[model samples]
Target: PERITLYTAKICPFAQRVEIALHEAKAHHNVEQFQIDLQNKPEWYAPKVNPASKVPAIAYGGPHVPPDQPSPESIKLAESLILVEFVADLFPHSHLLPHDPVKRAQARFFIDGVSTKFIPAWHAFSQGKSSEEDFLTAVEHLQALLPESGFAVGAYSIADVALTPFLGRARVTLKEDLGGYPRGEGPRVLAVLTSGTGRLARFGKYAQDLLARESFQATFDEAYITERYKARFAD
Candidate 1:
């Protein structure tokens, strides 16, 4: 991994997904990280790293790339899923993907289900545009998939990487005060169902397991997230 840089923002869950994969790839690849200020993205990153100026972009190669002087052969890429998959591919020895081809497909299936079926609801909730019922329908769908003793696909693969950031946010958001972010009522409903007083006991336990991974812990910044979400709603 030569001359690689990750442009990211702390408050972005999408960026967190990329961070998780990078942490998992620690043993095999070396990537430099740069924080992107969403409110004031570096002018140079525009039309270069990512024309849309989004966080979680990667600039690969160009060992001597300077400001406003990106290397012609330097590769730049964006989008959370693409970056996550690319990192996993870049470091195959990390086993970020499953060893067996079938299991790899299964991992992708689980990621697909979350990306398509679950995240949209959670996204809506986070934006304060969804109802508890809408959020819980997705929650229940994932709750049904919780295995007795392991991850979504029974291993610490990219499937876990895909889901952990959102779940990490949920853990903080489902607290007594929506962890001070106060999105929609989904947090309150989540606080109940995932609690001892609710019906999703197995899922509650599984969630704890998901949050316990070192990669998640290392990358998550709860206070920063709370402050960020609170600021969003304050406006």
Candidate 2:
């Protein structure tokens, strides 16, 4: 496999989705983490590499590319789905997608479901339809599709990887609102149930904890978030 570099910003849900794929694929890549201000963006980051200014860009085999003179030596992966697919392709051994053509089609169908149906519904519910009832309704709808086995698809493919960002955001938001809910007569609704962190955090934590692997831990610690970076938010 060739060397790679991932240009990303942590706050962007889109970028986080790519990180999840890279993590699952376990690809070899360095980070070019962007700051909130966008000053850290390279000259090549224009209409050249990406049309719109966006995080989660990449340049594989780019160390050889000269900053004063950029070249098409890199493969630019900007769109969220494309980036995740790119990562998956690198490791044929991962077998994220199905071998059967029908199953592969099923995976695509689910991807469309999450992108077209699930995410938009979640955003509308979270931003426009914010309330205890709405929250419960939305969670139940999502839960209907996602069985407790912890996978959106039968296998953990790019479909699950793509939707995790929106799921992650919804989960965190739920907790914040739940904590504020009234409970004078209460067992009291909690934040975790409200925010995505409460919902997905368990899965993420369980998955991350698979790092009982010291080699994994050491490799994770050694890598920095950004070669040049800034905080997106400081509350």
Candidate 3:
């Protein structure tokens, strides 16, 4: 229950993860949020807050002060996943980590799959560096990890928070056909992953559920992300 200052960026999926966690924890009102433009981060950020100069950093337990002037007395934490867990730990009643030990481990395992499998495939496919088949295979791998219903490992835990932002960005890019991949192929590929009665049926439902979550909807800015993607991937 200390003062939490979250330095975040809407354009960054990693930063969005922390944002979703804060919302899910119902701690957003209590936290002071500062948005860092990834295109031109303030010079003080790296030296004062995060040495790595990332958007999703947190300054915890500090005296009330402007986000730009983070105090050395506060604890600085970086990395989106780490920050998501930190929020969950800070609010146990939120149940972002789940009470059962096994479910907690399962949630972490799903997050690992997102980090190791889905993210890599998505990056490669979006950049046109990987074949469509390979990308679908990666999706299938995670789909296989689903529990037939509800969120990843169930109960809207950090695992869902971890993957939601990436899925939101992917949906926007693919829908707008704004990636390195062939123009029309983006939507088609997205359709395959979201089909109603196909190989990824469970995943389709899961994705729909994630996009529908209050936390995800609140944190995501579809129009802004679409415009940024257009600027980045314009032909």
lDDT of 1 by residue, 1-235 (tens): 6577788878788898889998888831466677877888778887778887887888888766553456657789999888888988888776788889988888888888789877888778655676767876776677777666788778788888888888888666655344334445545666555563466666666677778888888899989987766566556
- Clashing pairs in model 3, backbone N/Cα/C closer than 3 A: none
User: How much lDDT does candidate 1 score?
Assistant: 0.75
Candidate 2 global lDDT: 0.54
In angstroms, the error of model 3 at 107 is 0.7
Model 3 spans > 4 angstroms off: none
Error of 2 at 221 (Å): 13
- How many Å off is the CA of 148 in candidate 2? 7.3
Q: Mind giving the per-residue lDDT tens digits that candidate 2 earns over 53-107?
A: 6877766665565432435776666787787777777766666666778766766
Task: Indicate which candidate wins on lDDT.
Answer: 3
Cα distance off (Å), candidate 3, residue 30: 1.3
* lDDT per residue as tens, model 3, 1-235: 8889999988999999999999998888888889998888899999999899888999999688888888989999999999999999999887899999999999999999999999999999889888878888898888988997788887889999999999999999888887666668778877877764588788999998999899999999888988888888865
lDDT of 2 at 142: 42
Query: Stretches of candidate 1 above 4 Å error?
Result: 27-29, 66-70, 176-188
> How far in Å is the alpha carbon of 41 misplaced in model 3?
1.4
lDDT of 2 at 78: 76
